[PDB]
Design a protein around this ligand. Sequence first.
Ligand SMILES: [Mg+2]
Ligand SMILES: [Mg+2]
Ligand SMILES: [Mg+2]
Ligand SMILES: [Mg+2]
Ligand SMILES: [Mg+2]
Ligand SMILES: [Mg+2]
Ligand SMILES: [Mg+2]
Ligand SMILES: [Mg+2]
Ligand SMILES: [Mg+2]
Ligand SMILES: [Mg+2]
Ligand SMILES: [Mg+2]
Ligand SMILES: [Mg+2]
Ligand SMILES: [Mg+2]
Ligand SMILES: [Mg+2]
Ligand SMILES: [Mg+2]
Ligand SMILES: [Mg+2]
Ligand SMILES: [Mg+2]
Ligand SMILES: [Mg+2]
Ligand SMILES: [Mg+2]
Ligand SMILES: [Mg+2]
Ligand SMILES: [Mg+2]
Ligand SMILES: [Mg+2]
Ligand SMILES: [Mg+2]
Ligand SMILES: [Mg+2]
Ligand SMILES: [Mg+2]
Ligand SMILES: [Mg+2]
Ligand SMILES: [Mg+2]
Ligand SMILES: [Mg+2]
Ligand SMILES: [Mg+2]
Ligand SMILES: [Mg+2]
Ligand SMILES: [Mg+2]
Ligand SMILES: [Mg+2]
Ligand SMILES: [Mg+2]
Ligand SMILES: [Mg+2]
Ligand SMILES: [Mg+2]
Ligand SMILES: [Mg+2]
Ligand SMILES: [Mg+2]
Ligand SMILES: [Zn+2]
Lengths: 127, 60, 155, 24, 80, 98, 206, 118
Amino acid sequence: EQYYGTGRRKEAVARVFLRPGNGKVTVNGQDFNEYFQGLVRAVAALEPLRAVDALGHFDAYITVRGGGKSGQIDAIKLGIARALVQYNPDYRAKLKPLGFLTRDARVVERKKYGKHKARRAPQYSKR
Amino acid sequence: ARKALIEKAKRTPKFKVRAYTRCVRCGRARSVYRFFGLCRICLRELAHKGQLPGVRKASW
Amino acid sequence: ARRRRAEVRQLQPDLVYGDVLVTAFINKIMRDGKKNLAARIFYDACKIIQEKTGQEPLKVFKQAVENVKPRMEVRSRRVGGANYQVPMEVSPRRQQSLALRWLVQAANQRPERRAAVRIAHELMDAAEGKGGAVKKKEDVERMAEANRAYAHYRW
Amino acid sequence: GKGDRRTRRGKIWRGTYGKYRPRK
Amino acid sequence: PRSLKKGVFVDDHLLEKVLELNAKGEKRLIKTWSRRSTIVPEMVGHTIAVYNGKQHVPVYITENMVGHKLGEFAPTRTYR
Amino acid sequence: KIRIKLRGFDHKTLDASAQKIVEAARRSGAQVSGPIPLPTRVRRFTVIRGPFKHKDSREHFELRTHNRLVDIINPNRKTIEQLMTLDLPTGVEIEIKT
Amino acid sequence: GNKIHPIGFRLGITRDWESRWYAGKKQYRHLLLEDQRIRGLLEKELYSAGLARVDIERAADNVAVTVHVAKPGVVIGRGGERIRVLREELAKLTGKNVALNVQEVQNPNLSAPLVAQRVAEQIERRFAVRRAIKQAVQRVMESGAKGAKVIVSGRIGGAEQARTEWAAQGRVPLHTLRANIDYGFALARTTYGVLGVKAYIFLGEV
Amino acid sequence: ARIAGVEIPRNKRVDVALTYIYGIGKARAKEALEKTGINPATRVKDLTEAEVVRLREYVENTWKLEGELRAEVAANIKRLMDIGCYRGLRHRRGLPVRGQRTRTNARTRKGPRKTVAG
RNA sequence: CCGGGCACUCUAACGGGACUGCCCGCGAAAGCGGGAGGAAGGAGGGGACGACGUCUGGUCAGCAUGGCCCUUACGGCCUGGGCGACACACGUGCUACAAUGCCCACUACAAAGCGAUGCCACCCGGCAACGGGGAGCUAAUCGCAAAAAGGUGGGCCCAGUUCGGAUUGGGGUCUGCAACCCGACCCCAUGAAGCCGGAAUCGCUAGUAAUCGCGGAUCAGCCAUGCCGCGGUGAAUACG
Ligand SMILES: [Mg+2]
Ligand SMILES: [Mg+2]
Ligand SMILES: [Mg+2]
Ligand SMILES: [Mg+2]
Ligand SMILES: [Mg+2]
Ligand SMILES: [Mg+2]
Ligand SMILES: [Mg+2]
Ligand SMILES: [Mg+2]
Ligand SMILES: [Mg+2]
Ligand SMILES: [Mg+2]
Ligand SMILES: [Mg+2]
Ligand SMILES: [Mg+2]
Ligand SMILES: [Mg+2]
Ligand SMILES: [Mg+2]
Ligand SMILES: [Mg+2]
Ligand SMILES: [Mg+2]
Ligand SMILES: [Mg+2]
Ligand SMILES: [Mg+2]
Ligand SMILES: [Mg+2]
Ligand SMILES: [Mg+2]
Ligand SMILES: [Mg+2]
Ligand SMILES: [Mg+2]
Ligand SMILES: [Mg+2]
Ligand SMILES: [Mg+2]
Ligand SMILES: [Mg+2]
Ligand SMILES: [Mg+2]
Ligand SMILES: [Mg+2]
Ligand SMILES: [Mg+2]
Ligand SMILES: [Mg+2]
Ligand SMILES: [Mg+2]
Ligand SMILES: [Mg+2]
Ligand SMILES: [Mg+2]
Ligand SMILES: [Mg+2]
Ligand SMILES: [Mg+2]
Ligand SMILES: [Mg+2]
Ligand SMILES: [Mg+2]
Ligand SMILES: [Mg+2]
Ligand SMILES: [Zn+2]
């Protein structure tokens, strides 16, 4: 029928729905290659399905929002991972050794006073 | 600061531009927060006392 | 690194080749945090280097980076007055880092107008055994075999 | 770049509007 | 690049004084503590003493200097 | 449409007053949508610690105005029988717009 | 140069505001001014009556001024007389039609501002400050109060050079905010100078 | 390609090559290319004698230009200089006019640095 | 958008969750190395918090205050002027010297805040600053609003230039009683130095540096390139 994976990366949310089909993935009313046109890391979004031999066995519809498009791509990756796990749990044996089920918790660090941007200290000259 | 220099309180400044904040408690000459009507030193001490509701220790 | 060993960062693999050295080189090309523009530079250079010479850019890249890696260098050691240049070997990790840095710096010191063209021709020359990066490498190696009289100061 | 006030980037850096950066 | 954009502002102080001075013939030195006001055409011919903040300096007003202000000719600064 | 805008400087006070209102209205009325939370207005104030510099010492405080919504559906009498004036909380603030 | 105000630290957890109401952009300023006027008046008159805390609450033009006293007999007065004058003088400044409320505080030696006032009083009449200090810490320690601490400011006993006084007991951990640490400050104005009196009192755990 | 009082740009885009005229920047170049009905992206060499003559018609007499403009600006300086204006004094002493600070970084108007002792 | 629904993202209140608990190893112990499970581990990341005291550190020019001097006067009002001065010298920064770049159209993705005459959608006029009209939002519903780098398309062609915007001439808007001293902004024109910087010296060990924009407090206006926050992309390296 259909299986769901959410995923999250750097202030981005990518709801991923997976079904059987030919391998056509659409995003927010655009094909996957028109919305991420000319981005060299876009192929990493459909990377989690290369340990399961999808893209000809599967089909997807994704709705993504928030942050920048790179976080969107990686949240798509994670959401595809969880949808794939809920489809077939045995896929975990080929997923976590690849590392596609781990939530990347690297967040931008808040800015601190006395600094320029949160670590950079202002330059002194003749101490 | 100086008593007479709180003449802004009777405003009648002869011109609408001459209105400045003049923190109520300390009579601050330079740096006054308009929302509290206080200055950074008076705001600091009053928020330390606990007389400004809702004011907590910011941390994140 | 006073306390710990400063564990090496494990870079992400590459989306085109699946190789980590490609991602490291793309990072070395990146400036101001633009990995997208740097990747486009490297891959347009890949197309150019695969067309202007009918070889695979994979093994040419690998052979060039292998040709630029030096085997000895010099470090300054304070002994009996002013310090001296003491030769020694190189770590494999440091060989990798120095090779990629010399690659990028010799590529951008080239006359070619576009960045990708500079990258491609630099990789070609380095894969053939010539070029600017290999010249800097062989100067580093010429520092060795020259002040080798200090071979008893290895430390 | 950002200091050229009759270009678009100099307009967005100063935040103003004009002939070289119309509002909409 | 100087702008007043409508109803070019001239203070009442010297305005009424000079428009009543013109009616009886040209007058000699005048007193001016208001350099905020603009010069108007009918001021030409008089001798206006303006305030430096310390001193009273006389200025000969002519046709050429109509568009400018009183105080362009009274230098506040003193150097060399 | 009976909108009840709840606002305060204290979150537990808002929860107390809102839950009391909803518990009062639940014995008379409908499937009431109940206590929806709204985003909080955060006012930050950075103050240089010491008078007469040491510029780079400043600390900041934050006030936060919390907001809640009730949206009772089809109340007639018994809801407002337990509504007129029965509440304890003081720091809470209630508005009613229709 | 360290050790920020403890009650300002404590305001969030295990401590409450001296004024708890709500306002907006157009109201907060002069309402806070009115609170300051109330506390000013009550510090003018009620200093010698043994008052510790003034808690002011507002729902909607309703004022609930709450005075915590160590001796309610001076606040109420004989036949209630004194709860008439300054309760009317309170409304002769603010036209909000405000009423007054009194409350009892047990063990005046257990409230840190009251202990500060006490030590400052004994300092103004020029007692040996260290005896007042240790005696106050004992008054605190003789009834619960798992910690007590007293600090006095410079020019002690009238000395020309400024100094710093001491003699806490028990355990007074100002660093950790867990266990309801109370604090009070007093000002002793004397001929030689001004003496600050800081009274820290630690009681309870959670 | 002679257009105004002596002015010969060459081998570039026309709108760009018009900036080389004194009283013409990018705005007036775009306006000339607009109202003269000429392709801006054309090279200077490919300009028709009729296109060049129409550009001359417009640019030559619509705005004051090189010699007249230089003399007009310099005579404006002399005009506010001969009057006792403060702005004229700032032009006399060779100091900035727009109301900047002269304690530091008055280099453009005051010339190269002449370092006295201290 | 509607009917409608809470499952989802979300908003915000309470909780669960990590404890070297499991296993191998080493060890007398704490603990250390490795592994699985887990969103996450050996302090998961960031704050708030700064001991007895030190330097007679800093300000009575915030406040409060102990003493010594002032009283037609240091007090006090107002106008003008000043704190903006320049033959120089440093500190902190901003913008740059370009092709991984500039400009031009076209288009997509943030978080945190602010707004009752205050923010100002929208129509008109004006090249524009801005003006006139005027809707809505007591603001998860309205508005500031467009994010910018990025994407595709185009022009530029290694040149003091379609780099760089200082300086200066003119025209004009706006706040304001009033912009000479001494404001910001718009338009035309002028288009300077500068082609990676001597000795020396500074910041940063992970979303960090670097770069990109956004907001805020103070404020009629603003010389803010400052300061305090926000997110976008995202390194290099640590033998010792
Ligand atoms: Mg963050
Ligand atoms: Mg950042
Ligand atoms: Mg410093
Ligand atoms: Mg005083
Ligand atoms: Mg003002
Ligand atoms: Mg002010
Ligand atoms: Mg330009
Ligand atoms: Mg500062
Ligand atoms: Mg007290
Ligand atoms: Mg004593
Ligand atoms: Mg505590
Ligand atoms: Mg509906
Ligand atoms: Mg449910
Ligand atoms: Mg382990
Ligand atoms: Mg492990
Ligand atoms: Mg593990
Ligand atoms: Mg931690
Ligand atoms: Mg921690
Ligand atoms: Mg932590
Ligand atoms: Mg601690
Ligand atoms: Mg000291
Ligand atoms: Mg000193
Ligand atoms: Mg005094
Ligand atoms: Mg100054
Ligand atoms: Mg001199
Ligand atoms: Mg809109
Ligand atoms: Mg709502
Ligand atoms: Mg909505
Ligand atoms: Mg609402
Ligand atoms: Mg192009
Ligand atoms: Mg030159
Ligand atoms: Mg140029
Ligand atoms: Mg060049
Ligand atoms: Mg560190
Ligand atoms: Mg502002
Ligand atoms: Mg200026
Ligand atoms: Mg800014
Ligand atoms: Zn104050």
